[PDB]
Design a protein around this nucleic acid. Sequence first.
DNA 1: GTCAGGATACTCCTCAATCTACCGGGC
DNA 2: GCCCGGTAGATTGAGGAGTATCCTGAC
Length: 832
Amino acid sequence: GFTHAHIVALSQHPAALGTVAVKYQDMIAALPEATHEAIVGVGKQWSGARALEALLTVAGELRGPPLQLDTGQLLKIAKRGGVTAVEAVHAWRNALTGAPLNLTPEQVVAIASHDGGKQALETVQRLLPVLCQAHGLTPEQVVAIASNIGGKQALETVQRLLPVLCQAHGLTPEQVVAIASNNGGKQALETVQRLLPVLCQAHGLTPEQVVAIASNNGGKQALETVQRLLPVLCQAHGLTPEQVVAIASNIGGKQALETVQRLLPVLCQAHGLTPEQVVAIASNGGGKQALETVQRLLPVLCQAHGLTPEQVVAIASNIGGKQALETVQRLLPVLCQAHGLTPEQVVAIASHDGGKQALETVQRLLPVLCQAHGLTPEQVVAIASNGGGKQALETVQRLLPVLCQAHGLTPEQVVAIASHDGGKQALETVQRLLPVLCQAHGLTPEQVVAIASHDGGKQALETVQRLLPVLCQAHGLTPEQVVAIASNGGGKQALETVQRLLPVLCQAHGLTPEQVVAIASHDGGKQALETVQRLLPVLCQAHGLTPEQVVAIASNIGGKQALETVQRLLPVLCQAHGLTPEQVVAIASNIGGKQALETVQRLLPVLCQAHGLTPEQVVAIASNGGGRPALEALHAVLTDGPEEAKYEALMRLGGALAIRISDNSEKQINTAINLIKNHAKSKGVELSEEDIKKVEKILKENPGVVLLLTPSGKIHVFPSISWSLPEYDGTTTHGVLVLDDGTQIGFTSGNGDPRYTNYRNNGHVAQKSALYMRENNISNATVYHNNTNGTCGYCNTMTATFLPEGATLTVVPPENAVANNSRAIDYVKTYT
DNA sequence: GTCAGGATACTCCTCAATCTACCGGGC
DNA sequence: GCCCGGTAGATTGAGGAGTATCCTGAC
Ligand SMILES: [Zn+2]
């Protein structure tokens, strides 16, 4: 009962056709639930007939208590290992298990289910005690090394020359194991031994980079290509050696390097691609194929499909970009027209690993998922726009009804669970452990959903199931604390780190368990905890930082980086930049604090000296979340850009007084000089007579010039900006205090007086005008603001309250403005 | 019958930036 | 009781390893 396609596929081995038909009923009885695909996969190998006959003969005894091999495991071994591996396993059933080797059946299957399984199994059985005792190697490492094609040679090479690489090259056994855990490990190890001094001395390459390069499939060829092409790539093409080793640290890096060398000028001249884009595209598996596909299909996708080159690069910037590009070219118009999905969604689906599988699954499953199960196409694209989208989508298709009618979960919860990397694992773990968690430990379904909705939720859920009782009982933590700890990316590592490190971090450095939970409740909390352990005494005795400050610095996503950056940059910022350590702690106690600290170090002198900004303003700007982009944007706008943009950016920092007095009329020149003097004195800075003469010359020589008095003391001068209020952007309100004499004093909403913080109008322009009149004894003046909502309903009373006795004020809202509510007023009103 | 190399596909772990919904004192 | 600000979460994107499976050439 085989189809034509199955017979054609199995006809690769001519002798397998006869044996399968004669005894077709025989394997079914011996191998229950054996699907035709498994049979055709087993029988299509070099010894399909022999392997099938051996399985049929031996499966009666291969299911014994010493092995207890499942049917799927037997089929996999027959397909991969062959007749030799099956015979070796059967002949040594009692040798592998129940022996000083101490090998589980899963490890035995993994070693056997590989090319040359018999030789690898014999080598393991002969050399496991030797490598365990003489070299002190973990049996897991030996199994991992031997679980590869030609693993016997790699194991023998490791046993032969582990001490040589350990001593004469200073390489840890872990690096050797990682290098030898790939195909052709013996050749890679020999190449490393013969080449490490040459690549480390003449080429000046870090041994870690060489180890990383050699820790891939075919590392010997990659190392040889690197040695042969490093000077050429560094000189002719101007490629950084770090970039070269990053490109060559993938599977088949030799082909990628050759393609890059052969096609860099072509893509950089006849295609417009930058070297960085080509490097990024080539920094993935199958780089040669991706580069060739990009070069061949760039005009086709750019013109016929209307795709920007950046989108093509991003699609090809992943593993297997050739298949994704071909699938996009084949399936863009038919899927877009017949389903109406935006091309951005199609790009987002294929912008990950295995995008072709996700795209095909979406094309197949959109109608049925949207019809029977009721998912929105946006939800489907959200689930498919992740690593392994095919697995998550097929799992949703298979599993949604039983999850939504038996376990009492909503479809949106399932959509959230399945919309993460490895969503199939999370879905299956939920289906397997939801009753257990909701019964044995009392966790609510919402907590389980929250735990399972991160990258690697299966490991987090299993870790919770294993470690929740012991953490909750021995360590005295409420289950809510463990749920909070585990509900993060890579939460298994954080949970194991907490279980390991709670007693020492409590009884050694005197940290409250709540502090440990706060440190560990963020992504990458294991690194934060280890860094706190290693650094806390250093920050205590060597710099006088309290443990509370260390915990506050570490209680963020980038806690390790922030702590290391604080340790490295505390003396320089505290001595050569004039920053108090408290300001450093405040800057670092934010998400991405390492970048903020480095940006402060880099841009403090240029901002403080060239543009005349106080260090306090820089610290305040950098003390907010995401302060690095804010500082970079401020530097960009201050160094170049529009005059009005620079003026607004400078005034928005606060403490800056601008003036647009006009004409000569020496009297108001004197008054303006007096006002500048008063502001400088209020800032504690003496402006001296030379700057008085300078500003007087500027005022007398530039008609209609607007000044700016920063808190530092520098007087920025702008030639011309505008004589009218700017457009209202919805959050920033601008005002000008026009006196009777003629002086115009600019104002901007926000950054109000801290003294009246409890007052709700703190920051409005009318309040700033009132305080300015009160301080400088201004009798009468008017205001003009460009708020389109009119004056606020609080200001009409509060600003009149702040006015001095006997003082007058006027505010004029714009004519085009309309009041938004009864509180607001959209007409001229005189206050007193 | 093995050994070495290349190509996809998938999972998990750490980081940095931005968005928003709950709380809270004043009206 | 009803806000609008503050801010502590809560997405959202990104990169970097680590893991697993399959196909091909050469003896
Ligand atoms: Zn106001």
